[PDB]
Design a binder for this molecule. Structure first.
Ligand SMILES: O=C(O)/C=C/c1ccc(NC(=O)C2(NC(=O)c3ccc4c(C5CCCCC5)c5n(c4c3)CC(=O)Nc3ccccc3-5)CCCC2)cc1
Ligand SMILES: CNC(=O)c1c(-c2ccc(F)cc2)oc2ccc(-c3cccc(C(=O)NC(C)(C)C(=O)Nc4nncs4)c3)cc12
Length: 550
């Protein structure tokens, strides 16, 4: 069937940023009929997956438990109540949720309406690479449905993917753990080879059968009968597809593929992609495959059988994936250095800590993080990629020298260090206090993140070239600026001084010996686990039992 059908009704809205005018170009790309042929390899992997799912027990979340997970800036309900009312357990919201739930338990076929919108993403615009890129589409049900999804499937999506995929489940890793997995995977092979597999419009390639296969995996859990019916009804009425409505309330068409704004988007895409990829590994007869699946993103580390054999295996892998209804965007390239694989726009690099020891870390081209940050300083935005980039890429030269320096000088100038901000980062929305960045960074990357030096020439040159291209002052200017920022932060004591000490040690002539932050142990990061991209999940950072002297 067709991934989408359109009535022709325009997608209405509620460093450059893509608008809902360029959404028409995206519609042509994402619209196509799907051809899917399955085999024994696919059925075998599926059964092995289902067998692992069988070990899972999932709790049914209460109205309140589910309400408390709602982001405060989550799109308001067309039934006149919003994220705040939900979070506050307002009788109108709670009563409207209890009815949506009842309807899911009682109505098994009626499609649920979804809202289609364009996601305004800030970019740079490379004139050498060609032209502009279209805006991505966000398909999501009403607030009431969204709370019900959490009641039925939050515990499923939090525990099932790791039970099924184990170490292959990307979303379970902090950036430091992800790198540890990749490096060990690489080191474990006699002669390693690796590649990234990028599917052309993954959500669109997802068939209504793919969606039932994943409900079949969810159905292996020990579920409460209401959770079972909710999963069943949500599959038929929402996940397999339904009608598309713009912000103006007009019908835009109909969908028969993955909805990007549902709780099961990351989880379902991970399971689906893993299933197809593990099946394709067998079809292409790759030896000793290690997979890292992160939503629609895939990295395979296998055993090299020689340049010509490896190229042959990859073509076979692609042919299998295509049959499974997962054709590639760009055909995969085999790589013989781990640092050469690019996935989730990232690559593994190496540096030294304070004692000369090697430390691996994730990095990426800084152009987009810098442009988005340049836009975010220019105009107030409710979701800051800059803070997600600091947290995600804390060990990188560019996050430390440019992002940290620039934004702490602004927070200093606005006496807003204490003010919690909402940060994006791939999936879920996080409420983070900039003053907590050192503990966060220590927890996610290690104390070494504050002592990294001896960066590779390639990384240094990438960062420097990028600054020149974007009209950003050079690294020597940033070192100067970070010395004032540091000085002013130190003079403020407490967490602010820790920000100056730890985050800006790189800027001082004679380096300070940095001890582990004591308060880093008391931060609760238990929730940080799974990917909830479109999942509408809110996690505000908390600390159990704070020691007074902190
Ligand atoms: O050779 C030497 O010895 C010294 C050279 C040198 C060169 C330029 C300056 N510039 C400045 O001081 C000013 N801008 C900046 O000091 C500035 C800071 C951050 C900037 C950023 C981003 C960086 C990431 C965080 C958000 C801010 C961008 N641009 C920046 C400019 C350049 C700009 O204007 N816009 C963009 C556009 C896209 C990408 C980045 C930028 C402030 C007053 C005059 C302009 C200072 C020193
Ligand atoms: C298959 N591809 C991959 O696995 C990735 C590769 C890659 C690159 C090159 C390779 F040769 C291989 C793999 O680079 C990546 C960069 C980022 C992400 C990512 C995506 C989603 C969440 C988080 C995350 O870390 N988010 C934060 C809140 C910062 C976090 O800390 N999350 C946590 N989640 N649980 C505990 S902590 C990170 C994933 C990949």
């Amino acid at each position: 069937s067709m991934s989408y059908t359109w009535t022709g009704a325009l997608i209405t809205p509620c460093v450059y940023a893509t608008t809902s005018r360029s959404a028409s170009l995206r519609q042509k790309k994402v619209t196509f009929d799907r051809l899917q042929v399955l085999d024994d390899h696919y059925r075998d992997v599926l059964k092995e997956m289902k067998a692992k799912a069988s070990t899972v027990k999932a709790k049914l979340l209460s109205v309140e438990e589910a309400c408390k997970l709602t982001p405060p800036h989550s799109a308001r309900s067309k039934f006149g109540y919003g994220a705040k009312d939900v979070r506050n357990l307002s009788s109108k919201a709670v009563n409207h949720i209890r009815s949506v739930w009842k309807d899911l338990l009682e109505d098994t076929e009626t499609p649920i309406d979804t809202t289609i919108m364009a996601k305004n993403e800030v970019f740079c615009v490379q004139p050498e690479k060609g032209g502009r890129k279209p805006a991505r589409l966000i398909v999501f049900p009403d607030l009431g449905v969204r709370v019900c999804e959490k009641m039925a499937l939050y515990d499923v999506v939090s525990t099932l993917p790791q039970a099924v995929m184990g170490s292959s489940y990307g979303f379970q890793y902090s950036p430091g753990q992800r790198v540890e997995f990749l490096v060990n995977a690489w080191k474990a092979k006699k002669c390693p080879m690796g590649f990234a597999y990028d599917t052309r419009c993954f959500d669109s390639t997802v068939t209504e059968n793919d969606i039932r296969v994943e409900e079949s995996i969810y159905q292996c859990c020990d579920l409460a009968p209401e959770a079972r019916q909710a999963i069943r009804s949500l599959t038929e009425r929402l996940y397999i597809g339904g009608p598309l409505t713009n912000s103006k309330g007009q019908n835009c068409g109909y969908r028969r593929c993955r909805a990007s704004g549902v709780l099961t988007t990351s989880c379902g895409n991970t399971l689906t992609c893993y299933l197809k990829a593990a099946a394709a590994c067998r079809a292409a007869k790759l030896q000793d495959c290690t997979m890292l699946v992160n939503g629609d993103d895939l990295v395979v580390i296998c055993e090299s059988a020689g340049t010509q054999e490896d190229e042959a295996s990859l073509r076979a892998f692609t042919e299998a994936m295509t049959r499974y209804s997962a054709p590639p965007g760009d055909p995969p390239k085999p790589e013989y250095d781990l640092e050469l694989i690019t996935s989730c726009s990232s690559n593994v690099s190496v540096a030294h800590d304070a004692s000369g020891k090697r430390v691996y870390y994730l990095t990426r081209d800084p152009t987009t993080p810098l442009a988005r940050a340049a836009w975010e300083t220019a105009r107030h935005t409710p979701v800051n990629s800059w803070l997600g980039n600091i947290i995600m890429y804390a060990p990188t030269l560019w996050a430390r020298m440019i992002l940290m320096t620039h934004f702490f000088s602004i927070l200093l100038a606005q006496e807003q260090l204490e003010k919690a901000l909402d940060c994006q980062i791939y999936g879920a929305c996080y409420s983070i206090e900039p003053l907590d960045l050192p503990q966060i960074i220590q927890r996610l990357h290690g104390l070494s993140a504050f002592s990294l030096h001896s960066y590779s020439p390639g990384e240094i040159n990438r960062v420097a070239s990028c600054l020149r291209k974007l009209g950003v002052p050079p690294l020597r200017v940033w070192r100067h600026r970070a010395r004032s920022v540091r000085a002013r932060l130190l003079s403020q004591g407490g967490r602010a001084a820790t920000c100056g000490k730890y985050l800006f040690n790189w800027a001082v002539r004679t380096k300070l010996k940095l001890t582990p932050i004591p308060a880093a142990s008391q931060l609760d990061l238990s929730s940080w686990v799974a990917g909830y991209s479109g999942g509408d999940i809110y996690h505000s950072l908390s600390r159990a039992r704070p020691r007074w002297f902190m």
